Design an enzyme around this catalytic site. Structure first.
Site, PDB file in Angstrom:
ATOM      1  N   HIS B  77       0.815  -0.994  -0.116  1.00 43.15           N
ATOM      2  CA  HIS B  77       0.254  -0.437   0.414  1.00 43.15           C
ATOM      3  C   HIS B  77       0.635   1.234   0.255  1.00 43.15           C
ATOM      4  O   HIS B  77       0.439   2.447  -0.212  1.00 43.15           O
ATOM      5  CB  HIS B  77      -0.741   0.102   1.341  1.00 43.15           C
ATOM      6  N   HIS B 244      -0.510 -11.696  -3.365  1.00 41.15           N
ATOM      7  CA  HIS B 244      -1.933 -13.097  -2.884  1.00 41.15           C
ATOM      8  C   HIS B 244      -1.248 -15.056  -2.510  1.00 41.15           C
ATOM      9  O   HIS B 244      -1.900 -15.440  -2.336  1.00 41.15           O
ATOM     10  CB  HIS B 244      -3.179 -12.673  -3.601  1.00 41.15           C
TER      11      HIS B 244
HETATM   12  C1  HEM Z   1      -6.055  -5.910  -7.737  1.00 39.55           C
HETATM   13  C2  HEM Z   1      -4.826  -5.434  -7.185  1.00 39.55           C
HETATM   14  C3  HEM Z   1      -5.308  -6.615  -5.366  1.00 39.55           C
HETATM   15  C4  HEM Z   1      -6.360  -5.743  -5.374  1.00 39.55           C
HETATM   16  C5  HEM Z   1      -7.489  -5.667  -4.911  1.00 39.55           C
HETATM   17  C6  HEM Z   1      -6.177  -6.861  -3.544  1.00 39.55           C
HETATM   18  C7  HEM Z   1      -6.956  -6.906  -2.363  1.00 39.55           C
HETATM   19  C8  HEM Z   1      -6.398  -6.895  -1.173  1.00 39.55           C
HETATM   20  C9  HEM Z   1      -7.486  -7.366   0.091  1.00 39.55           C
HETATM   21  C10 HEM Z   1      -9.367  -6.451  -0.737  1.00 39.55           C
HETATM   22  C11 HEM Z   1      -7.216  -7.457   1.018  1.00 39.55           C
HETATM   23  C12 HEM Z   1      -7.359  -7.994   1.763  1.00 39.55           C
HETATM   24  C13 HEM Z   1      -7.124  -7.072   3.436  1.00 39.55           C
HETATM   25  C14 HEM Z   1      -7.758  -7.372   4.913  1.00 39.55           C
HETATM   26  O1  HEM Z   1      -9.208  -7.475   4.767  1.00 39.55           O
HETATM   27  O2  HEM Z   1      -6.439  -7.493   5.962  1.00 39.55           O
HETATM   28  C15 HEM Z   1      -6.201  -8.148   0.360  1.00 39.55           C
HETATM   29  C16 HEM Z   1      -4.349  -8.682   1.109  1.00 39.55           C
HETATM   30  C17 HEM Z   1      -3.299  -8.707   0.932  1.00 39.55           C
HETATM   31  N1  HEM Z   1      -2.475  -8.634  -0.202  1.00 39.55           N
HETATM   32 FE1  HEM Z   1      -3.552  -7.453  -1.824  1.00 39.55          FE
HETATM   33  N2  HEM Z   1      -4.376  -6.550  -3.868  1.00 39.55           N
HETATM   34  C18 HEM Z   1      -4.466  -6.061  -4.362  1.00 39.55           C
HETATM   35  C19 HEM Z   1      -3.569  -6.268  -4.662  1.00 39.55           C
HETATM   36  C20 HEM Z   1      -1.614  -6.841  -4.071  1.00 39.55           C
HETATM   37  C21 HEM Z   1      -0.604  -6.657  -4.338  1.00 39.55           C
HETATM   38  C22 HEM Z   1       0.331  -5.964  -5.912  1.00 39.55           C
HETATM   39  C23 HEM Z   1       0.236  -7.009  -3.593  1.00 39.55           C
HETATM   40  C24 HEM Z   1       1.866  -7.149  -3.484  1.00 39.55           C
HETATM   41  C25 HEM Z   1       2.338  -7.903  -4.366  1.00 39.55           C
HETATM   42  C26 HEM Z   1      -1.094  -7.447  -2.432  1.00 39.55           C
HETATM   43  C27 HEM Z   1      -0.586  -8.990  -1.474  1.00 39.55           C
HETATM   44  C28 HEM Z   1      -1.203  -8.864  -0.578  1.00 39.55           C
HETATM   45  C29 HEM Z   1      -0.842  -9.840   0.943  1.00 39.55           C
HETATM   46  C30 HEM Z   1       0.095  -9.948   1.137  1.00 39.55           C
HETATM   47  C31 HEM Z   1      -2.053  -9.160   0.956  1.00 39.55           C
HETATM   48  C32 HEM Z   1      -2.565 -10.102   2.856  1.00 39.55           C
HETATM   49  C33 HEM Z   1      -2.273  -9.000   4.316  1.00 39.55           C
HETATM   50  C34 HEM Z   1      -2.519  -9.907   5.333  1.00 39.55           C
HETATM   51  O3  HEM Z   1      -2.292 -11.295   4.997  1.00 39.55           O
HETATM   52  O4  HEM Z   1      -2.865  -9.539   6.690  1.00 39.55           O
HETATM   53  N3  HEM Z   1      -2.457  -7.784  -2.868  1.00 39.55           N
HETATM   54  N4  HEM Z   1      -5.803  -8.067  -0.195  1.00 39.55           N
END
Ligand code: HEM
Ligand code: HEM
Ligand code: NA
Ligand code: NA
Lengths: 713, 713
Positions: B77, B244
C-alpha cells in the site's frame, strides 16, 4: 478537491505554526527592513503623499477633490482589527492587503485607496513597507487637512501571506447575533477573543445593534468593542469624533448594485472589488457602506464642526438611498457641501453611532467637554490616533525614523534605559553558580524564568521577561505563577542580586530582569549536567527593571496565561480543547511545531508544571534534561484511558499487568495521537536523540528568553 | 473557526508551494539523510526485522504466527498510491503515516503494522527513514517466507507533513461511481490524474466494479488502474498472484463493529484506529476489509499454490461473515489452514479480482504461462516488486546501499555513465561564444533549454535536461516543444558540438545534454547584456546523452506538458482553470511562489512563449532581461476585460483613451489578481528592483537547469 480539513474538520491545525517561512518571502534571507527604512527619504515620501491627496484619478474620483477622508478611514481600518485579548489584528503587518481583510464588507472600497498608493509604493520600493505606508498615508491626510499629528514610527515589516486569526465561527458575512454560530451569549456577552459585533465589521454596526437604530444601545457596543481594542471612553469619543470630522460615507443607490468582494471577483478586476452597476459606479454615484452621511461643513479641513452639529441640532431618523438607517438634522439649512456638484448643499447628517456620543451619559460629558474645549479634543485625538496606529508595534525600541514621539506612554509598557556597564561572561558564570549554591532547585529556576519570559506574544509584541514585571502587580499574583512560591524565589534572587551588586566597581550591576533569566539558564544547565551533558545555555544581558508606576495593571490582565500547556495549566473549563489552546500559545510564542514539541517535553521533565502536578511527568529522573517524556509517551507497553472522575485526564497502565505507570492530560497525550506531532515526538524519542534533544531544547529555551529583546535587533 | 478556504473555496491555494519548509522539519538544516543511511548497519536492521516477523504482540496477534503477509500488504500500500500522470503518491516520502493515507479505508489496520515497527525505528533512529523502513520490511517479509528479492535501495528521506495531492473530489469515503463528484464519466473513463476507482482505495474494489462481482469487468478496472501506476499486464498478474501467495484478508464479523479511523479516533487511542467491538477485536476476530479469504495452503511460505488453486477449481459466489462478495472452490476439501486454530481447515477462496487473472483473456494467457513455468512467475514477481517499490525514487544515482541491483532497467530512465573528461570553465566560455556567434536568438536558446529542463517533477524525480531526451521521441515531437524550431536549434547546436569535440584531446567531449543547458545559459547572459547588465550564469557540466533504446516512449508520454504556464501554453480546454495548472507545474518543479513569479515574468520577456504568442509579453524590448512584465502588469493606467471570442483571453486597454495596449491569459493576469501573487509581483515591479529581478531570475533559472542533477548531490 477534498482535503484533510474536509475529512477531519476538528483535527488540530499545525500549519499555523509554519506560516511566514523563508519559502513564501520574496526578499533575501538577509533583508533587514529597519535598515532599509532608516535610509528612506521620509520627507520626500510625505511630499508625494501630500500631492496625491488632491490628484484625483478618474477611475475613483476624489470626493471634494481630496482623498484625505478615504485614506484616514483606510488607516483606521488597518489598525482597527486589533484585539487586546490575543494581540492579533492591527496595522503592524499590513494584513489589510491579504484575505480575508481585503474583502471584509467593512473594508469595501479600501481596495481603491490601496491602489491609489501603488505609484508611491513602486517609487520607494523596499524602503517603505505597505504596513508603514498605510499608516503614514493616514498621517499625511490629517496633516494636509490642518491637523498636527502626535508623531509616527516606521518599522512594521511587510508580511507575505495571510495571518491565521480566529475572527469568529459564522458562515455568513455580517450575520446578525443569535444564529447557530452566535458570537454573543448571556446578556450580550461577546466571546473572547473577538472584538467586533458581526463577522466582517471592524467594531460595531453603524445602523445600531443588529441594525436597530438606538444610539443608547449602540453606545454599549461601542464601549465594549473599543475596550476590547484597548481604548477607554475618552479615547473612543476622541477617535470617533476625530475621524468623522472628515470626509463622507457612500450610499448613493441600492446595495444590490454592488458586485463581488475582491477575493471573489473575476481575474480581470485585478485585485479590485465591489464593482457597482449604479450609474457611473464611482464618485458621485459611489456605494460603499450604503449610508449617505457627510458630517461637517468643511469635510476636507480639520474643525470642531462635528460636535457643533452633534449638539446644535435635534436629529431625525431617516434612510439613505440604499435603505440604511441614518439621521438628519431637523429644520436645518443646506450647509454641507456636495462632494462633486458646487451648486448643491445638504443638511447635516449623522450615524446612529455618532449619536451615541451625545445620548450615552458618560460619552455626553466627554463630548461636551471636547465641544467646549476644542484644544483638548485635538490633543486627545492626536494621542489616540497615535496609540491606535502603534498599539501593536511593541516596545519603543522597534520605533524607527525622525518622527518618533519622545514622550513615553503607559501603554507602551515602557522599560527604563540601561545606564550602567553590563555583566560579562565571567560575571554570568559567577551569578549562575551563586544561584545554584542558594538551594533554589532546577524546578524553581526553570518555572520562574518560564513564567517571566512566556508572557510574550508576537501578535503585538507585548510581554516577555524584559522589565521584571513578574515581581509587580498583577503578574506576581496570577495563579499560574504560583504567587507564594514565586515570592520566595524572587526574594532569594534579590538577595543574590544585592550581594553581587554591592561587590562591584565602576557602576557595573545586574537587573533583576536579567538575573531571573540567568537563573533559569543556570537551572537548564544544571539539568543538563544532571543528565550527563556539559552545555552552556546562552545568555544576553541588558534587560532593565520597570516600576509599578510604569506598569498599567489593567492592560497587563490580558497577558494572564489562562491556558499554558507548557506548564500543563488550565485556569478553568473552556469550549476549546486544551491541545488547540497549546498550539495557540505556541503560535503567540513564535514557535514551530518541532520547537513546541521539544520545549514541552523538556519542561515536563524539568518540573515546570503548575502545582507540581505529575501529569505528563514521564520520567524517573525529574530535574534531569532527558528525552524521557517522548520515550515513555511512545512506549506501546502502556495503554491509556480517560479517568472516571475527569475525561480530560488519562491513566497510562501497563498493558500486560494493569499497573498504573503515569497520568496525563490532553496536552500530554496529543503528542502521541496527532499524526504530525507523533512523527516529531518519534525523532526526539529515538535511541540516537538524547544529544539532539539537549541541544534543541537549549536553543528553543534561549529563543523564548530573548523574544522581547528588540534592543538587540 | 471560519477560514479563507470556507469563504472563497475556489481561490487558488499557494500554501502547496510553501509546504515542507525548514519550519516544520525537526532535523537540522545540515541533515543529510543519504549520509546517515550510508552509516546504517543494514544487516543488523534486517536481522531485527527477521526476528519481528514471528514476535506476536497481544494487542494485534500475528496470523499463522507470522506477520509477513501483513507487512507485505503494508509495503504494497505504501507504494500503491503512485500515479504515473503526475508522479505523486508512492512509497518515496513515507506518507502512509500522515493524513489522509494513514486513515484511508484500504489502509485499515496498517496502523498496527506501522506501530509494530516503532521499536526498530526507535533503535536505529535517523539512520533509517520510515519511508525506507516500510519497504525494507516488505522485503524482509518476503525473504523470511522463502522468496528471494531482486534488491533494495535506501535513500527515501522522511517528510514531516502531508503531501498536497488531489485524490478526487468525493465527499464520502468509498463513494460509488456516478455521484455528484464522480471520478468516472463516459464509458468508464477515470479522470486524470487519478489512479483508483473509489476515494480511499489503493487501486480497485476487491468485490468488483462498484461492488458488483464480475471478474471480467473487474479486470478492466485492474488493467486501467495498474497502467495508471506504470505497470503492464505481465507486471500486474505477477504482482497480484505474487502478493496473494501470502497471508489472508480479514472479515470475521459485520463491519458495523469497526470504529473510527485513526484521524477520527479519541486521543487515548494513541494514533491507532478501527477499534472493533466484534469479539476480541483482533487476531481470529480481526476485521479489516470485510472479506474472509485465505489463498494458499501455506500462507507463510512462498509456493506455487495460487495458480494451482485458481486453475484447479471452479468457483462459486458466496459471502464473507461481513456480507462481502467473495468466491469459494466448488467441491473442494478443507485444505487451507486456519490462522489461529490448528484443528480447523477451510476450503480455498478467492476475490473477484483474483478471478480476473483467469477470466480476462489477456491475463489468462499470462497466468497459464506462470502456472506452467513457475520460475518465470518468480522472476517476474521479483522484478515487478522491485519496480513497484522503487518506481518513484528517480535516477539510479539516488539509490543507496549494498543491495542495489546492478541491472539497469528501462523504467529507471537510465543515463549512461560519463567516461571522459568534462569541459571546464574556459571550454564553457568558448562554447557559449560559439553558440552566440551562430545566430541562434535569445528566444530560441532560452525556449530550448526551458523545454529540456522543465520536464522534471519532484514527485517521482523523473524528467529534466539530463539525458538530452528532448532530441529523442517523443519529446522532440511534442507540440509544446515546437518540433520544427526545436529541430533547427538542435541541428545548429549539434554542429557546434561536432566541431568542438573534433578539436579536443585526451578524450574530452561535451554531451548534447550539457550543450543544450549551456546554450540556454548563454541566451540568458545575452538577454541580460541586452538590458545593460553584466551577468555570468552558473553552469555545471556532467550530463550525458541517453539513447532512444533507453527512452521508453510510452512512459515518457506522461511527462508531456499539456499545461505549461511558463510558456503560456495550454494544449486543450480543461475543467481546471489555467492558473491552478500553473501552480501545479510549479509545485512539480519544486518552486516557491516567489520563484514561480520571477521565473514566469522573465520567461515572458525573453520570448519563451509557445508559438511566439504575444499574450503576456508586456515589454517593448523583447529578448532583454527586465522586470517589464511586472511594471506593465501592475499599471493602473490599463483596464482589463475578457474578449467576446474567448473568455480566457483578456485585453488590456488605456483607461483614458481606450487604445489596446496588451493581451494576456488567465496565467498572465493571475499575478495582478490573486492577493498573494500580486504582493510578490509588486516587489519585482518596483523602481528599486531591476537588479534584484535579474539576479533572482538567474538563481531560479539555474535551479531549474539543475533539478535532476543527483550525480552532484
Ligand atoms: C487488484 C489488486 C489487489 C486487490 C484488489 C487486493 C485486495 C486485497 C484485500 C482486499 C486484502 C485484504 C485486506 C484485509 O482484509 O486484511 C488484501 C490482502 C493482501 N494483499 Fe492484496 N490486493 C491487490 C493486489 C496486491 C498486490 C499487488 C500485492 C503485493 C505484491 C498484495 C498483497 C497482499 C497481501 C500480502 C495481503 C495479505 C495481508 C495479510 O496477510 O494481512 N495484494 N489484498
Ligand atoms: C463607532 C465607531 C465607528 C463607526 C461605526 C464608523 C462607521 C463609518 C462608516 C459606516 C463609514 C462609511 C464608509 C463609506 O460608506 O464610505 C465611515 C467613514 C469614515 N470613518 Fe468611521 N466609524 C467609526 C469610527 C471611526 C474612527 C475611529 C475613525 C478614525 C479616527 C473613522 C474615520 C472615518 C473616516 C475618515 C471616514 C470617511 C471615509 C471617506 O471620506 O471616504 N471612523 N465610518
Ligand atoms: Na497584531
Ligand atoms: Na511520488
Amino acid at each position: 478537491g477534498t482535503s484533510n480539513r474536509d475529512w477531519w474538520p476538528n483535527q488540530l491545525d499545525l500549519s499555523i505554526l509554519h506560516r511566514h517561512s523563508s519559502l513564501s518571502d520574496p526578499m533575501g534571507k538577509d533583508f533587514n527592513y529597519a535598515q532599509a527604512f532608516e535610509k528612506l527619504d521620509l520627507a520626500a515620501v510625505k511630499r508625494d503623499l501630500h500631492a496625491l491627496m488632491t490628484t484625483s484619478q478618474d477611475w475613483w474620483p476624489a470626493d471634494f477633490g481630496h482623498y484625505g477622508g478615504l485614506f484616514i478611514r483606510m488607516a483606521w481600518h488597518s489598525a482597527g482589527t486589533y484585539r487586546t485579548a490575543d494581540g492579533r489584528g492591527g496595522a503592524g503587518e499590513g494584513q489589510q492587503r491579504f484575505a480575508p481583510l481585503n474583502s471584509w464588507p467593512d473594508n469595501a472600497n479600501l481596495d481603491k485607496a490601496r491602489r491609489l498608493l501603488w505609484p508611491i509604493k513602486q517609487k520607494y520600493g523596499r524602503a517603505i513597507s505597505w504596513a508603514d505606508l498605510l499608516i503614514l498615508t493616514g498621517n499625511v491626510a490629517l496633516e494636509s487637512m490642518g491637523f498636527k499629528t502626535f508623531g509616527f514610527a516606521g518599522g512594521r515589516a511587510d508580511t507575505w501571506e495571510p495571518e491565521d486569526v480566529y475572527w469568529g465561527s459564522e458562515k455568513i458575512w455580517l450575520e446578525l447575533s443569535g444564529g447557530p454560530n452566535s458570537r454573543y451569549s448571556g446578556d450580550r456577552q461577546l466571546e473572547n477573543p473577538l472584538a467586533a459585533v458581526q463577522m466582517g465589521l471592524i467594531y460595531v454596526n453603524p445602523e445600531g445593534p443588529d441594525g436597530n437604530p438606538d444610539p443608547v444601545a449602540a453606545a454599549r457596543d461601542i464601549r465594549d468593542t473599543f475596550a476590547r481594542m484597548a481604548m477607554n471612553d475618552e479615547e473612543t469619543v476622541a477617535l470617533i469624533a476625530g475621524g468623522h470630522t472628515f470626509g463622507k460615507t457612500h450610499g448613493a443607490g441600492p446595495a444590490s448594485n454592488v458586485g463581488a468582494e475582491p477575493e471573489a471577483a473575476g481575474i480581470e478586476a485585478q485585485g479590485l472589488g465591489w464593482k457597482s452597476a449604479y450609474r457611473t459606479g464611482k464618485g458621485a454615484d459611489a456605494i460603499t457602506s450604503g449610508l449617505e452621511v457627510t458630517w461637517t461643513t468643511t469635510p476636507t479641513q480639520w474643525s470642531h464642526n462635528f460636535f457643533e452639529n452633534l449638539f446644535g441640532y435635534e436629529w431625525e431618523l431617516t434612510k439613505s438611498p440604499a435603505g440604511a438607517h441614518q439621521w438628519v438634522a431637523k429644520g436645518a439649512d443646506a450647509v454641507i457641501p456636495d462632494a462633486f456638484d458646487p451648486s448643491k448643499k445638504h443638511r447635516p447628517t449623522m450615524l446612529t453611532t455618532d449619536l451615541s456620543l451625545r445620548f450615552d451619559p458618560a460619552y455626553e460629558k466627554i463630548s461636551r467637554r471636547f465641544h467646549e474645549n476644542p484644544e483638548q479634543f485635538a490633543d486627545a485625538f492626536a494621542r489616540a490616533w497615535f496609540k491606535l496606529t502603534h498599539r501593536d508595534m511593541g516596545p519603543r525600541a522597534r520605533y524607527l525614523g525622525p518622527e518618533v514621539p519622545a514622550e513615553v506612554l503607559l501603554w507602551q509598557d515602557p522599560i527604563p534605559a540601561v545606564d550602567h556597564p553590563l555583566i560579562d561572561a565571567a560575571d554570568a558564570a559567577e551569578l549562575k553558580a551563586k544561584v545554584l549554591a542558594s538551594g533554589l532547585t532546577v524546578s524553581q529556576l526553570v518555572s520562574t524564568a518560564w513564567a517571566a519570559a512566556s508572557t510574550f506574544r508576537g501578535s503585538d509584541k507585548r510581554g516577555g521577561a524584559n522589565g521584571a514585571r513578574i515581581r509587580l502587580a498583577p503578574q506576581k499574583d496570577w495563579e499560574a505563577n504560583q504567587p507564594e512560591q514565586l515570592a520566595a524565589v524572587l526574594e532569594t534572587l534579590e538577595a543574590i542580586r544585592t550581594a553581587f551588586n554591592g561587590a562591584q566597581r565602576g557602576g557595573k550591576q545586574v537587573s533583576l530582569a536579567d538575573l531571573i533569566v540567568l537563573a533559569g539558564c543556570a537551572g537548564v544547565e544544571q539539568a543538563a549536567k544532571n543528565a550527563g551533558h556539559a552545555v552552556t545555555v546562552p545568555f544576553a544581558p541588558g534587560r532593565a527593571d520597570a516600576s509599578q508606576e510604569q506598569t498599567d495593571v489593567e492592560s497587563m490582565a490580558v497577558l494572564e496565561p489562562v491556558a499554558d500547556g507548557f506548564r500543563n495549566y488550565l485556569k478553568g473549563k473552556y469550549r476549546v480543547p486544551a491541545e488547540v489552546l497549546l498550539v495557540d500559545k505556541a503560535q503567540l510564542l513564535t514557535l514551530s511545531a518541532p520547537e513546541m514539541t521539544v520545549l514541552l517535553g523538556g519542561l515536563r521533565v524539568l518540573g515546570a508544571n503548575v502545582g507540581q502536578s505529575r501529569h505528563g511527568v514521564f520520567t524517573a529522573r525529574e530535574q534531569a534534561l532527558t528525552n524521557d517524556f517522548f520515550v515513555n509517551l511512545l512506549d506501546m507497553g502502556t495503554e491509556w484511558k480517560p479517568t472516571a472522575a475527569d475525561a480530560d485526564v488519562f491513566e497510562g497502565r501497563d498493558r500486560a499487568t494493569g499497573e498504573l505507570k503515569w497520568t496525563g492530560t490532553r496536552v500530554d497525550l496529543v503528542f502521541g495521537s496527532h499524526s504530525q506531532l507523533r512523527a516529531l515526538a518519534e525523532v526526539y524519542g529515538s535511541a540516537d536523540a538524547q544529544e539532539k534533544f539537549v541541544r534543541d531544547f537549549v536553543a528553543v529555551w534561549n529563543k523564548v528568553m530573548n523574544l522581547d529583546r528588540f534592543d538587540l535587533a
